[PDB]
Ligand binder design. Structure first.
Ligand SMILES: CCOc1cc(-c2c(C)noc2C)cc([C@@H](C)O)c1
Length: 127
């Protein structure tokens, strides 16, 4: 029933780089999803205490949210695009695992995921 510590967003010993794909993931992908009308539940870790979801973190062992993704991208946390893409997919999948078809949050995830897919479909070639 308690909240876990949030995922890490900084690790000074992780090697970093700034690729055109990672720049796209921030400037296009994250920006598009973050501004969406359905973004709000996903802009920070699930607060299982405030939401009274005492079994959330019993079921979800790899939490992810866009607040975390945003900080990771802004801190150059990633080495490659695939790591960031995996974070977004973890976020969606968590929502699908925990929730039920047709729940509001699932419809929201689905809308964001459709936009995600459209954007990732045009991920630029690494230069
Ligand atoms: C600030 C978080 O607000 C919400 C969080 C959820 C949520 C998430 C994210 N993952 O599982 C649940 C439940 C669902 C809803 C509303 C849309 O019902 C709102």
């Amino acid at each position: 029933s308690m909240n876990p510590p949030p995922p890490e967003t900084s690790n000074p010993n992780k090697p970093k780089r700034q690729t055109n794909q990672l720049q796209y993931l921030l400037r296009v992908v994250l920006k598009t999803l973050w501004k969406h009308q359905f973004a709000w539940p996903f802009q920070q870790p699930v607060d299982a205490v405030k939401l009274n979801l005492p079994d959330y973190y019993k079921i979800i062992k790899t939490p992810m949210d866009m607040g975390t993704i945003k900080k990771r991208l802004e801190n150059n946390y990633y080495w490659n695009a695939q790591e960031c893409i995996q974070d977004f997919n973890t976020m969606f999948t968590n929502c699908y695992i925990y929730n039920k078809p047709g729940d509001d949050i699932v419809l929201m995830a689905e809308a964001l995921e459709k936009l995600f897919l459209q954007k990732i479909n045009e991920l630029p070639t690494e230069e």
